[PDB]
Amino acid sequence: KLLLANWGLPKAVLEKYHSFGVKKMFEWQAECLLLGQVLEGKNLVYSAPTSAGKTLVAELLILKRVLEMRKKALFILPFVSVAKEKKYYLQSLFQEVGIKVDGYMGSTSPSRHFSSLDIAVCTIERANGLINRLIEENKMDLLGMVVVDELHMLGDSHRGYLLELLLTKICYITRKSASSNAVQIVGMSATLPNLELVASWLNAELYHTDFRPVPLLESVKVGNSIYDSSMKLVREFEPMLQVEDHVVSLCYETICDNHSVLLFCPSKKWCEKLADIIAREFYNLHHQAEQKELLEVMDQLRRLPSGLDSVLQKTVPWGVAFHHAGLTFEERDIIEGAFRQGLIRVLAATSTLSSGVNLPARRVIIRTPIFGGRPLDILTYKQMVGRAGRKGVDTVGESILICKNSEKSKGIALLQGSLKPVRSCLVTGSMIRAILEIIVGGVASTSQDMHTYAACTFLAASMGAIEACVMWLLENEFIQSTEKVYHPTHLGSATLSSSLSPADTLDIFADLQRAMKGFVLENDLHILYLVTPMFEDWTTIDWYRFFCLWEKLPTSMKRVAELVGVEEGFLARCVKGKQHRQMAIHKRFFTSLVLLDLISEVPLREINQKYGCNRGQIQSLQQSAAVYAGMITVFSNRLGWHNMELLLSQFQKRLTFGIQRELCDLVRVSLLNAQRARVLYASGFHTVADLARANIVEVEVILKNAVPMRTIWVTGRKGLTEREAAALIVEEARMILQQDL
Template identity: 35%
Template sequence: MEPPRGILHKTTVESTTLRHGSFHTTTLAGSKRPHTDDNGSRHQPSTAERAVQFQRASTIGKEPPELSASTIEAVDPDSAARTSEYSQRLAIPATPTSTVDRSLSLSFPRYGLSEPLVNNLKALGIKDIYPWQKQCLLGPGLLNGTRNLVYTAPTGGGKSLVADILMLKRVLEDSDSKALLVLPYVALVQEKVRWLRNIVHGLKRQQSNQDTPKKEESSLWQRRADEDSVRVIGFFGGGKVRATWSDFDIGVCTFEKANTLINAAINECTITNLRSVVLDELHMVDDDHRGYLMELIATKLLSLEHEVQIVGMSATLQNIDLLSRWLNAHTYCTFYRPVPIEEHLVHEGKIYPASSTSGLLKTASQLASDSNASQPQTQPVRIVHPSPHKELKDPVLNAVVALATETAKSDFGALVFCNSRRGCEFNARLISRALRNTCSLDPTMLEKRLDLLADLRSLSTGLDPTLAETIPSGVAFHHAGLTTEERDLIANAYDNGVLKVLTATCSLAAGINLPARRVILHNARMGRDLIGPSMLRQMRGRAGRKGKDEIGETYLCCRKDDLKDVIELMHAELPQISSGLTTDKHRIQRALLEIIAIRLANSRDTVLDYIQRTLLHLSATSDNIETHVESSLRDLAEMGFIQSESDNYAATQLGKAVVASSLEPEDGAFVHREMQRALRAFVMDGEMHVLYMFTPVQDLSVVINWQVFRSEMERLDDSGLRVMTFLGLKPTQVNKMAQGGNLKETTPAEQEISRIYRRFYLALQLRDICNEMPIHLISRKYDVPRGAVQTLAQTCQGFAAGMIKFCEQMNWGAMAAILDHFSDRLNAGAKSDLLALAKVTFIKSRTARVFYENGFKTVAAIANADPKELVPILMQAQPSKVRLKSKDEQKYEEKLLAKAKVIADSANKLWQMEMMQQVYEE
């Protein structure tokens, strides 16, 4: 069932006023908003009443009627105590502890972990390890770093701790050693950075026996202030940190950043400090979109002359033996989960048990075969009664709402995976309506939810109206359409039990660690496609919270028409891993160009030696590999990336620029053509040309709203129109598309011009970001989610960094300087005059402009201000929002005051740095 579109996009445009009774301000440039004082004898609403106010305000006074979730009844009342998930207390065999087996203690001498490290882990709740973790760690050559490891364990089974221990041992045993932890998603990188910083807090590293005497003899050597500490730095696209190889001890990276770091270190001959590389989600190695970069990383490491311990792990590895042969690694497999999972199939309102995949298959098969009634059929253990509400006539939707509300009312957490972003929001609203009548049960919890709403309101994007409606009931949605700040607040609230139900797209299953007592799949499709067995296992693996739940539960709600597909899905084995280098995207070209550019190979023999170390060598025939290698080398030479002479290879200046900028060869050729054309006639009297130049070229799946494109084109000045003409874009074509025409993409020339149209459309959004238009207004203007606008800005920052390196490598210094300036503007979301203010925490875009217009034009002015003086400025910078009662407005202002204190502290630190710099310059 699709949600009605209109109701999801309504907002209340009523300005929030400032009460000067709470904050005293000095005279500022600019006008102040009118204010009222709600103090006095007015009735102060209860917590429950205030929750309803939020819900009503979010729906513009039209409060949707309450829903009552369908009851779920046990088929066999006598066995209800055994089958009901909330009354059962299974006799699960206890896991051995360190009191029984001393080797399960982290302080066991054989592990060689220092006492401070053991104490830090204990402080984070890790006192003992599981038997499987012990067996894995004690594998041959693992603790001393002489052997690689590939292992698989279920989600929630504790597999990350094994990699953390091995990696930390390599880093702590030598002050010069480095380690890389490679993860697929930015959210995982950020989460892991926080985790590792807690683990290494206060730890000291051993001095290198080889280098210490040399350092002591040198009178020029001085110890770095943090020489013995462990520095954990995160690397990801759009990240603010521009750290280099020498700035970290443990680098937590996305695939792309890890590959770039390793290329640079090999090229600069500093790679010898690398001692450990952990590859998480190793099953993605055959993904030719991003995961293939893991094969490039690992193969380069295997080609080095010094040993680097490679640790690969995944919850969904099928042919682990192949990976073991590739990485020359010890292997370990376990199916242990500290919290067992009960699996269920929900079909036409009936819940069938499936304690294993085969059990679920048997149940589904019997359901599908109703021709032979004489055969015994698996009986459901519970039944979801039909709903009298028209919104819940669909049996799948009715089951989802009933299961989710049952979980929340029993004070457990539920994750509901939906097939689209709109589906997430729609389900969240229905579930919250079903839970609304329970709001008065726990005033303390409602108070925490109102605090969460205040936090969301204090963000620069304001409070989403759907979240305003659902959060008071303990329900929220989580998808890429939200901004990073919104997703973080919601995830933390769910993890802390403030929210009980979270509806999410499938990306949450792999993108962040949020377990639940109950995982509910709203049918077996994500979008239009059936989910794969790996994704199904990841989503189901989120069930069960160690330390909070005795058991985890999964419910796959299957549509009647999908039953056959579900049977095939459940029957499907996990996919076999193979190399992704020989797909139609020609990834092997990038592999060969990189090793030649970083001088890891310079002849046919060394190229073949590299190829023999790839996963490709083990998963394809020799003739097929040789064909791909020969054609790829020939294509690289034709594109001008390499030169060959007598079977010797060298990268050209262009080839080195492509590798330095982390581009695919095909994308690098496109960028080079665009750059060369721009250098001949760069349009400098406006912003559109430079913004276009650092709009990403990779995988532009953006859908153009041609009516918006035409409207924006008509508003372009002469400079912008000249850029369009220069790029080969035709206003007549845009008008034709806005009237329903089709953009042909049959020939290579048509595909290239289509790519240019998409880049220019994104450049229009970047122009608005750089000119201080708030994200929520850009989102509304281009009809895209707020999170998509933020992701575009972050992606462009990463791409711009690559383009700067490209220009520097090509000796195009002027172009690099222009791109660098606009990269700073994009990061700030502001014009040039605000770049200094934008360095202050929480001050970006519209907020920076409001500060500037109110007289705070310098960092020093903010640093010397009382935080209370900054609250009215922050109020003015917020988007329009609902007007609520005084107590909630007071909470909102308290959140802004806390933010103002952070701003003042940040400005003070920056100001002190500026003062010190001036002293040194004098």
């Protein structure tokens, strides 16, 4: 019984599991699976440590549900990168058996329509939109089971409220059908204290385990000594070589042990400085003053669109690297990818790596309990350390939080502390969309039945203004009042389809309708101004730098700014010598200026020297602004503005890839991001139709040139050789031509 072979799974999936090394099934997962009536369809929510293999139970459940009853399934994952990684893993797992998978990661959308799809692995922001679309045309029968991850974020978070709304909509739908269950919900979480309340809200039984494949022991240092969590001295520290912080010694213990070490840093500048220090201290500690494959990783970064960074030069050919938010989205995967293989030994990361892809390491070191001027949160601290200890390789994993003076008292509190219990975050802006998602889909019409929906949410299960909040929608024309029975309006139905927050729509509707008065078409700026999402905190603005850029703007672009509220007289003028809606317009204009250079295919390095914002915040904005163009276009489609939908139709593809209008068709191949299509375009190939018929040997030479054996890189499959990738360029083009016709 304690073997995967005894459990029922297709053969191909099983041999795929041997390919990944997972040959022993833990007792906790099997016991939780046999526990209760989970198999026959009743929902479940469970918790486990991150390194224990939380995904195994979800994968077995989705397999069994798909094979038992023919019904499509979902995969809700927090971030885009983890979503793409899980998409590729699931695809490699599911190729042979027949359950095709394809993902909805923000900007990117499937070529095939959903009813053909089976497992739609997707982020929350578009999982909610897909659920709304399915609930729209009474087509919820295809859904058979839904996977959610990290249930702890539905509380105080920017996007978890979408997850809670989607879950409560599913619960409301299945409880309406009772007038065993239509749709399964499975989930994984951290060591949540109130997970029973969460489990009871979805009438699921609770199973909580703390079992770990390898032991984990935290440690806190006091000067030149190491203290355990429970006021215990487990080891006496003694630095070997160094030239109270004694940073190199802790990593130096790992190097002589032949194991990897993860050393995260508070802020952006700390990662570069710390990475150089360890690389600098490797000059004399190992030279008295895998190389071949390490140079290949360095060779990978040489002709990346952003090139190879200066600080990355002095560290990479020594086993030391660093990885933060400011790096390019392509160098982030290379550094992470080779870390899995073990080429790099030291990483200087920020807190963003905590929530990303699994990065196993034997020793994890945290710089300060203070992260960015604020104390470290307990929730991210559990997954801060959870990566320590490789499965089946390392028998002991440890974490060494570094504290000084009086900060030790604050630091030790995290070791004995527990992550805060979840909330519901539900006037409230996250509840306005909650009732708009149900009364516009037509499932709930009578007000009394709507009151039962508020009895099905997380707020109700935890243990007035709900009825006072539909009046807020009544004021803003979102709903028409009839005999009470509520019916959606043109604005109400357009917001739901495009999946925008009703708070933002009121401004957009009055902003998009102000393009009726006057529009410019010589330059893409005004079109881009209506697709720039917001400012958030994507970068720090440079006003004097904006002044020099403001003057040098040609005549055509300056016409746009005056038309949207930006003032030539006041722009980088009063801020130097010293309005919230006015302030959010000027940043909106700067966001549109940056995006226009992105869609002009200007070098990413050149934008840094000109725009002051580095490549890390650029792709974190063009990916976020590409989703916005995909929501404005749908918003204008349902609102009956056929002319505006025409202009913004092509701007989702342009912002995602930073391409021009010419390369829109070439880029449809997944292996041509932004430069593999430009150099290919100059080779006389202007469309994907005739690129599919290209000579295989012809594309090899053209791809060799334009340089700013597995040395060429493609997202999702790590590195590749030039001969194979060039063959993949044509091979992908073969499959596109007949699959869409």
